């Protein structure tokens, strides 16, 4: 494989055959992974092929998703704690999120965002990417 990019795994990625069957192992955040940077669709979902393996990992977990804030957002380490020293992001700013929504112990859903590491945890509440806040 001659076309290869390196990216941190931002979310523990299940490894899948070309048919979208789980192979029983994972790639782990925040290790680097080598991928062929060509999007591959399998049963409606996007993957990258791991370099020199007939293995596929979800794009969302690697290069993630461009999302636009619909509301001012604080950056959270956990349910009740802001990432230390962080400010806010504003309605209209663009954020890279990785992976599906994650349910914290408060019961609310979060997106892991660019820069999140074990010593620098960075999440935004999912609702801040939706128009309707009928919950305030
Ligand atoms: Ca807010
Ligand atoms: Zn609002
Ligand atoms: Zn409001
Ligand atoms: Zn609101």
From TrEMBL:
Classification of source organism: Bacteria, Bacillati, Bacillota, Bacilli, Lactobacillales
Residue stretches making up the S-layer protein C-terminal domain: 59-126
Protein name: SlpX
Residues the record lists as binding Ca(2+): 72
Protein origin, superkingdom: Bacteria
Organism the protein comes from: Lactobacillus acidophilus (strain ATCC 700396 / NCK56 / N2 / NCFM)
Binding of Zn(2+), residues: 71
């Amino acid at each position: 494989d001659t076309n290869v990019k390196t990216y941190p795994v931002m979310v523990d990625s299940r490894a899948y055959d070309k048919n979208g069957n789980y192979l029983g192992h994972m790639y782990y955040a925040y290790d680097n992974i080598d991928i062929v940077p060509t999007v591959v669709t399998i049963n409606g979902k996007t993957y990258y092929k791991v370099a020199n393996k007939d293995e596929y990992v979800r794009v969302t977990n690697i290069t993630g998703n461009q999302r636009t804030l619909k509301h001012n957002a604080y950056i959270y380490w956990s349910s009740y704690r802001r990432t230390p020293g962080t400010g806010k992001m504003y309605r209209g700013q663009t954020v890279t999120t990785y992976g599906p929504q994650m349910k914290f112990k408060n019961g609310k859903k979060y997106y892991r965002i660019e820069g999140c590491r074990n010593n620098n945890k960075r999440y935004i509440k999912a609702v801040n990417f939706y128009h309707h806040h009928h919950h305030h």
